[PDB]
Each structure stands twice: as structure tokens, then as C-alpha cells.
A paper describes a structure:
A major step forward was the discovery in 1999 that the primary repressor of NRF2 is [name], with 27 cysteines in humans, 25 of which are highly conserved. To determine the pKa of [name] [name], we used a construct containing only three cysteines (versus 27 in full-length [name]) consisting of just the [name] (Broad-Complex, Tramtrack and Bric-a-brac) domain (residues 48–180, with a S172A mutation), which has been widely employed for crystallographic studies of [name]-targeted electrophiles.
In contrast, for the C151S [name] protein, the protein was unmodified by monobimane, confirming that only [name] is modified in WT [name]. Positive electron density near [name] indicated that ligand was bound. However, the density was ambiguous and not continuous, suggesting that the ligand was flexibly bound and adopting multiple conformations. [name]-conjugated monobimane was also docked using this method. Overall, the data suggest that monobromobimane, with its relatively flat geometry, largely hydrophobic nature, and possibly its ability to make hydrogen bonds, fits well into the relatively flat, hydrophobic [name] pocket in multiple orientations that place its electrophilic carbon near the [name] thiolate, significantly accelerating the reaction relative to the simple thiolate in NAC.
Author numbering: 50 to 180
């Protein structure tokens, strides 16, 4: 009496569309303004719900108890713009790539937004690079 179906690639396909929408700057409700020390300021438009799905830190920031009147600007310090870019790409794609010289800075940024997956991968890379 009961019929049930699952599309395994669905989440992969849907995240692909969400990343397309980020890059077109469509349906975005947060702008991250990133200023790190000497480097020129940068900004990143995104979807609060997607960032929240990949970072307990963004989730708490955005789930405030009074719903938001539109597009929010968020000031970020202490993370290089190039690192934030890579973390956002991870959330939207599940992949991240960097040069060996940047692995430490990305791990630092991933600790700051509690992206446990990226923390683990970077830690494991650094340790293999020993001895």
C-alpha cells in the first residue's frame, strides 16, 4: 500500500544550483564585509540558510529571535579575505583547495566558524607533512 523513492544525487544537484545563485548574487540576504589587517577590504554575498547549514557559528549569528528586515551586512575581522572565500566555497560545494603555504590560515579560519570537517582535513595534512 506504500511507495517510497530517494534521489541520492539530489543534494549534490541542489547545492550546485545554490552555488550558481550565489555567484549570480540572487536571493542573497547577507553580505560579509571582510577587512583583514593590511589587505584590501572584500565582500561576499551569500545565503544565511546555506552558511548556517555548514557552520554552527553562522547559524547562531543568524538565528536571532526577531526576523530580519532584509539584507544584513556583517563585519568580519581576523580572517584574510582569501580564506573566507575558500570557506564559503566549501559550504556551497563541499570542496576546498589551497596551496601548502595557506593550509594553516585556512585551518585557523575553519576553527573560527566551527567547520569541523575542514578542521580535521587540515590537521591531518599538517601532521603528514612532519618527519
Amino acid at each position: 500500500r506504500t511507495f517510497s523513492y530517494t534521489l541520492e544525487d539530489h543534494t549534490k544537484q541542489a547545492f550546485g544550483i545554490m552555488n550558481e545563485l550565489r555567484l549570480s548574487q540572487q536571493l542573497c540576504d547577507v553580505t560579509l564585509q571582510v577587512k583583514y589587517q593590511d589587505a584590501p577590504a572584500a565582500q561576499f554575498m551569500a545565503h544565511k540558510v546555506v552558511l548556517a547549514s555548514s557552520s554552527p557559528v553562522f547559524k547562531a549569528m543568524f538565528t536571532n529571535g526577531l526576523r530580519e528586515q532584509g539584507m544584513e551586512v556583517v563585519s568580519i575581522e581576523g580572517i584574510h579575505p582569501k580564506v573566507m572565500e575558500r570557506l564559503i566555497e566549501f559550504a556551497y560545494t563541499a570542496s576546498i583547495s589551497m596551496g601548502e603555504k595557506c593550509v594553516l590560515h585556512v585551518m585557523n579560519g575553519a576553527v573560527m566558524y566551527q567547520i569541523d570537517s575542514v578542521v580535521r582535513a587540515c590537521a591531518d595534512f599538517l601532521v603528514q607533512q612532519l618527519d
